[PDB]
C-alpha cells in the first residue's frame, strides 16, 4: 500500500511509474521563515520532488553534541515539504561536496585517532555509519519515509565517490561496497542511489550529475535513468565572476535527457541561497550561493528561467501518461535532427522533435506536418501533433534586479583589535611551525603565529641604509605580516592556488624584534582526493637574509600561538557580551584601519522586500546581526576572468556566460528579514582589511520587467 520501487523505466511510487521533476534546496542555506515560500514557489514551478543534502558538520559540531534547531531543523523542513504535497530526495552523504565547509565532515572527525576519510578505514566507517543510521532513524521515528506515508522517496549515500574510488583503487572499491550494503541494510523501504558510481551494487541506482546527462544510462538495464544534478549555473568564488547558464540551454539539456528515457531529473540548485556564518561556505566559496538558480539567492523568481522551466514541466506532465507506458524510439529527421517518440499501446503518443544545429533554424516534416526548430532546441508534442513547447522559445518575461537603498548612513562606533606579539608568558608554543587546522580545530578563521627575532649590534645592515629580507611561505589563504606591530603587507591566494608567499624588506632595529603573522582561512576545501589532508597556515619555510650570516631559517626556533581574535574571545558579536569593552564614538571612529570591529543599531526598514547590506565601502571580514552571522564579506576581492557575451546555443561550460568582471566578487550581503526585530537591531562587523563603515547601507531587493 505504501511502497516506492523502480524498474527499467521509472521510480514506482505506490505501484505507478512516475516521471519525477526535482529541485535542490539546502535547508541551512535559507531560514525556516523562508522554507514555506521557497517550497510553494518550487511546486508552482512544476516540481514534484524537493532535493537536499544533510549537513553533518552543521549537525554535530561537537562529538556527541547534536544540532537540529532553527535553519538546521531538518525534520521541520521535510514536513514542510510533505505539507506541500511534494516528495523528498534525501542525499545523506555524509560527504556532500556541495561547496560546503570541508565537504560536510566536522573538522573534529579529522583528528579522531587512526582516521582516514572516504576509504576502507574503520574509524571512518563507524563514525559514518553512526551519523547515517542516526539520520535514518530520525526520519523513521517521525515516519517520514514513503514506506510510512512520508515524503522521502529515495536517499543518497556518499556523493560522487566514483572518481575518487578510481584514483584510490582497492580500498575505494571495498569502501563503496561497504557503504551500499550499510545504507540499504538500514531497511528504509525506499531505494538508495549513488551519483557518479557505475560500480554501484544492486539494489542501488547509479545516477549522474552534469550540465548534460542525456547519454547516461545506469549500470543495469533494470534500473531507471536518473539525473541528480542538472547544473543550473555554477557557484561564485571569492575573486571570481558571477556565472550564469542560459534557460534555453537548461531546457534543451533537460528535454534531451527526458526524450531519451530520462525518468528523474533534479536541478542543482533550484534555490541556492546563502552561505551564512563561518561554517558553511567552502574553500574560497563566496557567501552568495545564487548559482543562477530558478529562485535567486533571496528567494525571488529569477525570470525568465523560472517561468521557462515551469512551462517545460507542463509539457512533460501532459506527456507523462505516454511516457510511463512506452519506451523511447528514435527516428532520423536530418543530419542533426531526430524525433524521439513514446507511442503507447493504449494510444497515447508523445514525441520530441530536436535540432542539434547550434547555428541555423531547421524545418522537419513529422507525421505529415511541418515544425520549425530554432538552433539548439527541442519541441515537445505531448500528443505527437501539437508543438506546445520549444526549449528555445521563451514565453516568460525577463526581470532585472534593483538593489535600492533603505539606510543612507548610520551611527557607528569602533573598537580596534589587539596586534599581538610574542611573550615569555605565552601559553601555547612549540619549536617550529604548526598547521593551522591542527591548532584552531576550525574554531576561528584566524590564527596568530608569533616569534622573536634577536638582532645584535654587530649586524651590518644597521650602519648602512639597508633593510633585511623577510620571506614567509604559507599554505593559505590570507597572510598579514606584522613586524614590531607594524603591518608590512598582505598577501592572499585563489581557489586554485591558496598557497601564498610574502617576500620583502622589513625594518629591524637593534635588539629583540617582534614578527607577528595573522593567518586566515576562507572555508575549508570540499572536493578532491584526500582534500582533508591539505594544509592551511604558515608551515614555511621562513627565512631572514641580508645579514652578517647568509640567511637565518626562522622555522627552526620557538613560536607562540593565539587562536582567533581577542574580539572573538570577548564575543563582541553577540547581544549580551557586546559592550564589555572600550568603543570609540564619533569622528574618532576608525577609518581605513585594519583589524577593526564596528557597531551600529538600526531599525528594520519598511516593506515586504528581502534585504542586503551594501558592503562595497569595506574590504574583508565577518558580518553579524543580532548575534547571528550573516557570513564572511570580501568585497575587496575584485572578480577576475574572461566574461564576454553569451548565446544559449551550443555545448555549455561553466565559464561560457560569466558576468561581473572588474567588480567586487560579492558586494551585497543578504540579510534575512527572518532575523530582524522592528527596532533595536544589533549590527557588528569585523573589518579585516580596512574600510569606511559610513558607506554601509541597507538595500531593498526588487525585480521588475
Ligand X SMILES: OC[C@H]1O[C@@H](O[C@@H]2[C@H](O)[C@@H](O)[C@H](O)O[C@@H]2CO)[C@H](O)[C@@H](O)[C@H]1O
Ligand Y SMILES: CC(=O)N[C@@H]1[C@@H](O)[C@H](O[C@@H]2O[C@H](CO)[C@@H](O)[C@H](O)[C@H]2NC(C)=O)[C@@H](CO)O[C@H]1O
User: Residue 433's binding partner, choosing from ligand NAG, ligand X, ligand Y, none, with beta-carbon cut-off 5 to 8 A by kind?
Assistant: none
Rounded least distance, CB 343 to ligand Y, Å: 12
Footprint of ligand NAG on 580-609 (CB under 6 A): none
Contacts of 238 (CB under 8 A, 6+ apart): 284, 285, 286, 495, 522, 634, 637, 665, 666
User: Which one-letter DSSP state was computed for residue 269?
Assistant: E
How many residues touch ligand Y under the rule CB under 6 A: the total is: 8
Rounded least distance, CB 180 to ligand X, Å: 18
Closer Cβ to ligand X, 461 or 534, answer by number = 534
> CA end-to-end span of the chain, whole Å?
48
Closer Cβ to ligand NAG, 412 or 559, answer by number = 559
User: Residue 51's binding partner, choosing from ligand NAG, Cl ion, ligand X, none, with beta-carbon cut-off 5 to 8 A by kind?
Assistant: Cl ion
Footprint of ligand NAG on 413-472 (CB under 6 A): 434-435, 438-439
- Is 210:189 a contact under the CB 8 Å cutoff? no
Q: Which residue(s) pair with 704 in the sheet?
A: 400
Distance CA 320, CA 230 (A): 20
Closer Cβ to Cl ion, 90 or 517, answer by number = 90
Rounded least distance, CB 221 to ligand Y, Å: 6
Rounded least distance, CB 535 to ligand NAG, Å: 9
User: Which one-letter DSSP state was computed for residue 640?
Assistant: P
CB-CB neighbours of 512 under 10 Å: 13
Q: What angle do CA 420, 108, 139 make, to 5 degrees?
A: 135
Q: Binding ligand Y by CB under 6 A: which of 24, 30, 188, 261?
A: 261
- Is 54:319 a contact under the CB 8 Å cutoff? no
Rounded least distance, CB 53 to ligand X, Å: 7
Footprint of ligand Y on 1-20 (CB under 6 A): 8-9
Rounded least distance, CB 441 to ligand NAG, Å: 7
Residues in the site for Cl ion, rule: CB under 5 A?
24, 51, 53
Classify burial at 114, counting beta carbons within 10 Å of its beta carbon; exposed 0-12, middle 13-18, buried 19 or more.
Answer: exposed
325 binds ligand Y (CB under 6 A): no
Rounded least distance, CB 365 to ligand Y, Å: 22
C-alpha cell at 616: 562595497
Closer Cβ to Cl ion, 51 or 532, answer by number = 51
Closer Cβ to ligand NAG, 333 or 554, answer by number = 554
Q: Where are the beta strands (DSSP E) in 204-261?
A: 205-210, 225-231, 242-244
User: Residue 327's binding partner, choosing from ligand Y, ligand NAG, ligand X, none, with beta-carbon cut-off 5 to 8 A by kind?
Assistant: ligand Y
Closer Cβ to ligand NAG, 73 or 435, answer by number = 435
User: Residue 492's binding partner, choosing from Cl ion, ligand X, ligand Y, none, with beta-carbon cut-off 5 to 8 A by kind?
Assistant: none
Q: Which residue is nearest to ligand Y (CB)?
A: 8
Rounded least distance, CB 346 to ligand Y, Å: 17
Rounded least distance, CB 87 to Cl ion, Å: 14
Cis-peptide, bond into residue 94, ω within 30° of zero: yes
User: Which one-letter DSSP state was computed for residue 116?
Assistant: -
Rounded least distance, CB 115 to ligand NAG, Å: 13
Closer Cβ to ligand NAG, 100 or 434, answer by number = 434
Alpha carbon separation from 68 to 60, 61, 106, 282 (Å, rounded): 9, 11, 15, 21
Q: Distance from CA of residue 228 to its chain's centroid?
A: 16
Query: How many H-runs (helices) and E-runs (strands) does the chain carry?
Result: 10, 40
Footprint of ligand Y on 221-240 (CB under 6 A): 221
Rounded least distance, CB 27 to ligand NAG, Å: 33
- Is 280:631 a contact under the CB 8 Å cutoff? yes
User: Residue 648's binding partner, choosing from ligand X, ligand NAG, Cl ion, none, with beta-carbon cut-off 5 to 8 A by kind?
Assistant: none
Rounded least distance, CB 91 to Cl ion, Å: 5
User: Residue 570's binding partner, choosing from ligand NAG, ligand X, ligand Y, none, with beta-carbon cut-off 5 to 8 A by kind?
Assistant: none
Rounded least distance, CB 448 to ligand NAG, Å: 15
Closer Cβ to ligand X, 160 or 447, answer by number = 160
> Helix, strand, or coil here: 83?
helix
Q: Where are the beta strands (DSSP E) in 174-278?
A: 192-195, 205-210, 225-231, 242-244, 262-271
For helices 35-44 and 74-83, the axis angle rounded to 10 degrees is: 40
Classify the C-alpha dihedral 436-438-442-443 as positive or negative: negative
User: Residue 88's binding partner, choosing from ligand X, ligand NAG, ligand Y, none, with beta-carbon cut-off 5 to 8 A by kind?
Assistant: none
> Helix, strand, or coil here: 574?
coil
Taking phi first (over 0 means left), then psi (-120 to 50 degrees means alpha), and beta for anything else, what does residue 540 get? left
Footprint of ligand Y on 164-183 (CB under 6 A): none
253 binds ligand Y (CB under 6 A): no
Distance CA 695, CA 86 (A): 44
User: Residue 435's binding partner, choosing from ligand X, ligand NAG, ligand Y, none, with beta-carbon cut-off 5 to 8 A by kind?
Assistant: ligand NAG
Rounded least distance, CB 260 to ligand Y, Å: 5
Q: Which range touches ligand Y (CB under 6 A), out of 55-63, 324-332, 486-494, 647-655?
A: 324-332
Contacts of 78 (CB under 8 A, 6+ apart): 88, 90, 139, 144, 150, 151, 152
Distance CA 24, CA 662 (A): 30
Residues in the site for ligand X, rule: CB under 6 A?
96-99, 159-160, 163, 196, 209, 229, 235, 527
Q: Binding ligand Y by CB under 6 A: which of 68, 111, 327, 360?
A: 327
Alpha carbon separation from 482 to 40, 255, 470, 545, 637 (Å, rounded): 52, 57, 11, 17, 21
Closer Cβ to ligand NAG, 426 or 435, answer by number = 435
658 binds ligand Y (CB under 6 A): no
260 binds ligand Y (CB under 6 A): yes
- Is 376:392 a contact under the CB 8 Å cutoff? yes
- Residues binding ligand NAG (CB under 6 A): 434-435, 438-439
- Residues binding ligand Y (CB under 6 A): 8-9, 221, 260-261, 327-328, 330
Amino acid at each position: 500500500e505504501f511502497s516506492v520501487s523502480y524498474d527499467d523505466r521509472a521510480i514506482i511510487i505506490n505501484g505507478k511509474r512516475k516521471i519525477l521533476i526535482s529541485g535542490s534546496i539546502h535547508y541551512p542555506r535559507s531560514t525556516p521563515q523562508m522554507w514555506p515560500d521557497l517550497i510553494q514557489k518550487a511546486k508552482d514551478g512544476g516540481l514534484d520532488v524537493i532535493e537536499t543534502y544533510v549537513f553533518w558538520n552543521g549537525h554535530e559540531p561537537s562529538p556527541g553534541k547534536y544540532n537540529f534547531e532553527g535553519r538546521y531543523d531538518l525534520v521541520r523542513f521535510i514536513k514542510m515539504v510533505q505539507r506541500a504535497g511534494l516528495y523528498v530526495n534525501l542525499r545523506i552523504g555524509p560527504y556532500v561536496c556541495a561547496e560546503w565547509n570541508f565537504g560536510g565532515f566536522p573538522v573534529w572527525l579529522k583528528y579522531v585517532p587512526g582516521m582516514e576519510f572516504r576509504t576502507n578505514n574503520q574509524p571512518f566507517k563507524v563514525a559514518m555509519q553512526g551519523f547515517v543510521q542516526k539520520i535514518v532513524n530520525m526520519m523513521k521515528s517521525e515516519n517520514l519515509f514513503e514506506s510510512q506515508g512520508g515524503p522521502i522517496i529515495m536517499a543518497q549515500i556518499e556523493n560522487a565517490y566514483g572518481p575518487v574510488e578510481w584514483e584510490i583503487g582497492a580500498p575505494g572499491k571495498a569502501y563503496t561496497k561497504w557503504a551500499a550494503q550499510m545504507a540499504v541494510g538500514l531497511k528504509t523501504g525506499v531505494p538508495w542511489i549513488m551519483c557518479k558510481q557505475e560500480d554501484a551494487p544492486d539494489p542501488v541506482i547509479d545516477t549522474c550529475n552534469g550540465f548534460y546527462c542525456e547519454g547516461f544510462r545506469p549500470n543495469k538495464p533494470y534500473k531507471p535513468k536518473m539525473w541528480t544534478e542538472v547544473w543550473t549555473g555554477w557557484y561564485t568564488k571569492f575573486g571570481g565572476p558571477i556565472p550564469q547558464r542560459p534557460a534555453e540551454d537548461i531546457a534543451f539539456s533537460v528535454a534531451r535527457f527526458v526524450q531519451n528515457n530520462g525518468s528523474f531529473f533534479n536541478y542543482y540548485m533550484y534555490h541556492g541561497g546563502t552561505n551564512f556564518g563561518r561554517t558553511s561556505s567552502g574553500l574560497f566559496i563566496a557567501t552568495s550561493y545564487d548559482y543562477d538558480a530558478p529562485l535567486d539567492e533571496y528567494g525571488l523568481l529569477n525570470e525568465p528561467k523560472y517561468g521557462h522551466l515551469r512551462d517545460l514541466h507542463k509539457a512533460i506532465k501532459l506527456s507523462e501518461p505516454a511516457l510511463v507506458s512506452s519506451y523511447a524510439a528514435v527516428t532520423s529527421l536530418g543530419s542533426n535532427q531526430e524525433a524521439h517518440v513514446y507511442r503507447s499501446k493504449s494510444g497515447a503518443c508523445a514525441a520530441f522533435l530536436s535540432n542539434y544545429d547550434s547555428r541555423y533554424s531547421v524545418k522537419v516534416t513529422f507525421q505529415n506536418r511541418p515544425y520549425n526548430l530554432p538552433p539548439w532546441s527541442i519541441s515537445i508534442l505531448p500528443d505527437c501533433k501539437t508543438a506546445v513547447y520549444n526549449t528555445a522559445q521563451v514565453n516568460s518575461q525577463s526581470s532585472s534586479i534593483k538593489m535600492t537603498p533603505a539606510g543612507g548612513g548610520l551611527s557607528w562606533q569602533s573598537y580596534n583589535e589587539e596586534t599581538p606579539t610574542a611573550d615569555d608568558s605565552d601559553t601555547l608554543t612549540a619549536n617550529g611551525l604548526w598547521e593551522q587546522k591542527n591548532v584552531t580545530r576550525d574554531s576561528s578563521d584566524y590564527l596568530w603565529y608569533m616569534t622573536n627575532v634577536n638582532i645584535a649590534s654587530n649586524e651590518g645592515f644597521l650602519k648602512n641604509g639597508k633593510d633585511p629580507y623577510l620571506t614567509v611561505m604559507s599554505a593559505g589563504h590570507v597572510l598579514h605580516v606584522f613586524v614590531n606591530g607594524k603591518l608590512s603587507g598582505t598577501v592572499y591566494g585563489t581557489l586554485d592556488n591558496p598557497k601564498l608567499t610574502y617576500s620583502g624588506n622589513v625594518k629591524l632595529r637593534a635588539g629583540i624584534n617582534k614578527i607577528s603573522l595573522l593567518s586566515v582561512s576562507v572555508g575549508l576545501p570540499n572536493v578532491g582526493v584526500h582534500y582533508d589532508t591539505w594544509n592551511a597556515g604558515v608551515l614555511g619555510p621562513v627565512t631572514l637574509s641580508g645579514l652578517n650570516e647568509g640567511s637565518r631559517n626562522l622555522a627552526k626556533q620557538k613560536w607562540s600561538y593565539k587562536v582567533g581574535l581577542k574580539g572573538e574571545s570577548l564575543s563582541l558579536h553577540s547581544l549580551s557580551g557586546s559592550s564589555s569593552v572600550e568603543w570609540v564614538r564619533g569622528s574618532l571612529m576608525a577609518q581605513k584601519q585594519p583589524l577593526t570591529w564596528y557597531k551600529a543599531t538600526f531599525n528594520a526598514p519598511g516593506g515586504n522586500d528581502p534585504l542586503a547590506l551594501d558592503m562595497a565601502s569595506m574590504g574583508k571580514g565577518q558580518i553579524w546581526i543580532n548575534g547571528e552571522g550573516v557570513g564572511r564579506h570580501w568585497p575587496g576581492y575584485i572578480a577576475q576572468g574572461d566574461c564576454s557575451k553569451c548565446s544559449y546555443a551550443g555545448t555549455f561550460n561553466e565559464k561560457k556566460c560569466q558576468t561581473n568582471c572588474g567588480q567586487p566578487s560579492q558586494r551585497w550581503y543578504h540579510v534575512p528579514r527572518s532575523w530582524l526585530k522592528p527596532s533595536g537591531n544589533l549590527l557588528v562587523v569585523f573589518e579585516e582589511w580596512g574600510g569606511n563603515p559610513t558607506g554601509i547601507s541597507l538595500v531593498r531587493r526588487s525585480r521588475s520587467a
